[PDB]
Amino acid sequence: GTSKLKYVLQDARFFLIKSNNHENVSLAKAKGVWSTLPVNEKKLNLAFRSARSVILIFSVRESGKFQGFARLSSESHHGGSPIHWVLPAGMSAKMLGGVFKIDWICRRELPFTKSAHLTNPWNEHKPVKIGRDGQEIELECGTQLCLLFPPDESIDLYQVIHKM
Numbered sequence: 001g002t003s004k005l006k007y008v009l010q011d012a013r014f015f016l017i018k019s020n021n022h023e024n025v026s027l028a029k030a031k032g033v034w035s036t037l038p039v040n041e042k043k044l045n046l047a048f049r050s051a052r053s054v055i056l057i058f059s060v061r062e063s064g065k066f067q068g069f070a071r072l073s074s075e076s077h078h079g080g081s082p083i084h085w086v087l088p089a090g091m092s093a094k095m096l097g098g099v100f101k102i103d104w105i106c107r108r109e110l111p112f113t114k115s116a117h118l119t120n121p122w123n124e125h126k127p128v129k130i131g132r133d134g135q136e137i138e139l140e141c142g143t144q145l146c147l148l149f150p151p152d153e154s155i156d157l158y159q160v161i162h163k164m
């Protein structure tokens, strides 16, 4: 069902995360982690303290799809095991902030064609697929976007509910 999912999303905050390649999303899905530039790291740390759930919705550039969504389980931290991100020409591993732990809620894809009816008030009411890495998505838009994803029957939200 969708009842536990709605419970996790109640009063949540949502952020669009844009990866330049599939490899970084694969790493995030395998290891339960994400690292972003310091400008976004500061926004996510503030959001984590402010809301009962902070949801990252991932999209690989030029893929025409979202690749899933996850909930922050921690603020960012440094000094952990290294993560071999594949970075665009211009981004360096030192330039990345710390590492956030994340719990995946859905590892399934959603094509942009399916979210064409959702606009984001925090990005001039443009379609929700449009946004820079780190763009915040307003509550109602973000909730409806997450509810469009196919259910991921491999995930049990019971443990996520307990972290809240």
Ligand SMILES: Cc1n[nH]c(N)c1C#N
Residues within 6 Å of the ligand: 009, 010, 011, 012, 139, 140, 141, 143, 144
């Ligand atoms: C209203 C409201 N409160 N929490 C939500 N996920 C919503 C929506 N949509």
Ligand SMILES: Cc1n[nH]c(N)c1C#N
Residues within 6 Å of the ligand: 018, 019, 020, 021, 024, 035, 036, 037, 085, 086, 087, 088, 133
């Ligand atoms: C890794 C990572 N963190 N933030 C990004 N825009 C990427 C990529 N590609």
Ligand SMILES: Cc1n[nH]c(N)c1C#N
Residues within 6 Å of the ligand: 031, 032, 033, 077, 079, 080, 081, 082, 083, 099, 100, 101
């Ligand atoms: C991997 C990894 N590097 N840093 C972390 N906090 C993790 C986790 N979990």
